[PDB]
């Protein structure tokens, strides 16, 4: 079982700069028919993979010379001489030379872009949810960059972790930012036992937390 070792796990590159991705197989990828079936694919956010290169170095139609594939035996390299906006996504190799075919782990390619503070919005529980005896306080922190961010919840000033569920989007194709969703769910009994609810984000674009909060008292 040929193992495809892809490195690095993630790459962050500035538009116009080069990017190098590696795939090494545990065994030689030279097939019995004399060919070397090493493919390179690209899976854009939300999209299904699409092959860019086959047979180690042949480009599929449409693919720019920016992309080159090289190597032989066990060492293969996907190269982008000048990276760009459209390139962001997950890359991975796929070898079809031996039974069974195997895929590389993948390399998430991040395209650097100017810093952006997260746009924060906090939402009190919806009326229709307070009738079911549950209460959820949703908080969005959208279109920020870099990806490193940290959210903290505070009820009447006390940090709250129990009941917090977070979710993050991959890098966006349009503006290359990241978004986060943090949802604090507690019981209506408890929710009604506290006043102010706060959503705090710690991001590089601010030395002080980027806060957003409301008071249950609709005040």
């Amino acid at each position: 079982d040929v193992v495809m070792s892809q490195t690095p796990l993630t790459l962050s590159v500035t538009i116009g700069q080069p990017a190098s991705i590696s795939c090494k197989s545990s065994q030689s990828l030279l097939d019995s028919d004399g060919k070397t079936y090493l493919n390179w694919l690209l899976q854009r956010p939300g999209q299904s993979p699409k092959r860019l290169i086959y047979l180690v170095s042949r480009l599929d139609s449409g693919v720019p010379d920016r992309f080159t594939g090289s190597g032989s035996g066990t060492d293969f390299t996907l190269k982008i001489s000048r990276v760009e906006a459209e390139d962001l996504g997950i890359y991975f190799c796929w070898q079809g030379s031996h039974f069974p075919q195997t895929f590389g782990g993948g390399t998430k390619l991040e395209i650097k872009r100017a810093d952006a503070a997260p746009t924060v919005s906090i939402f009190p529980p919806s009326s229709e949810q307070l009738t079911s005896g549950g209460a959820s306080v949703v908080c969005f922190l959208n279109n920020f960059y870099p990806k490193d961010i940290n959210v903290k919840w505070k009820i009447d000033g006390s940090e709250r972790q129990n009941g917090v569920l977070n979710s993050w989007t991959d890098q966006d194709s349009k503006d290359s930012t990241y978004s986060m969703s943090s949802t604090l769910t507690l019981t209506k009994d408890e929710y009604e036992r506290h006043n102010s609810y706060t959503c705090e984000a710690t991001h590089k674009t601010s030395t002080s937390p980027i806060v957003k909060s409301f008071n249950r008292n609709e005040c």
Partner: protein
């Protein structure tokens, strides 16, 4: 127009069977070999085998030469992946590919004794930044459902800009997902912003307008 359209999401109990289909078009079906790939949740890709679209002969990877069947309906350019005696390990999203260049959207299969639980959809209206940036962000909360997947869109898909629909999160033994859409302070409440959701596994489809 080269496309591979696979059958929809599937929820099965350990022991039942599933026959997933992939309708192809946009090229000469029988000139391309077809591969079958499995992807366990959060895991990488796994090659299940392939089918010779000309001869119809299937070939299975060792881990799938027991309860998996690959078949065709050549005349209809359709390939089929059947899994018998379903086990929890079979839970994942499966794909059909044209050789190595094109992929289908993939179909998600969940195998568990647990019973389908429809999602609860709550709208989310402002209460903070009025017009400190002239922008407005609204949301829609989908919680307590099982299993994956679910589908969400704003105003039937007629609104896909400034939208962020995050990956669902396994809370208890239930998934929760949310989405947000940002519009100009004017556009709302001036216009109607409705949330659309559908939970195939529980034949569910709901809406929820967002109001002040």
């Amino acid at each position: 127009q080269i496309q591979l359209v696979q059958s929809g999401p599937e929820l099965k109990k350990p022991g039942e069977t599933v026959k997933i289909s992939c309708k192809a078009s946009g090229y000469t079906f029988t000139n391309y070999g077809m591969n079958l790939v499995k992807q366990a949740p959060g895991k990488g890709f796994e090659w299940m085998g392939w089918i010779n679209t000309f001869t119809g002969e299937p070939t299975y990877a060792d881990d799938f030469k027991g309860r998996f069947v690959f078949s065709l309906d050549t005349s209809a350019s359709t390939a089929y992946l059947q899994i018998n005696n379903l086990k929890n390990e079979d839970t994942a999203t499966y794909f059909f590919t044209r050789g190595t260049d094109y992929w289908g959207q993939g179909t998600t299969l969940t195998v568990s004794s647990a019973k389908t639980t429809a999602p609860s959809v709550y709208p989310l209206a402002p209460v903070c930044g009025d017009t400190t940036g002239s922008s407005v962000t609204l949301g829609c909360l989908v919680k307590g459902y099982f299993p994956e997947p679910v589908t969400l869109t704003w105003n039937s898909g007629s609104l896909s800009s400034g939208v962020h629909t995050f990956p669902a999160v396994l809370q208890s033994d239930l998934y929760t997902l949310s989405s947000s859409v940002t519009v100009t302070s004017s556009t709302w409440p001036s216009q109607s912003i409705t949330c659309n959701v559908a939970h195939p596994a529980s034949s569910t489809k709901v809406d929820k307008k967002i109001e002040p």
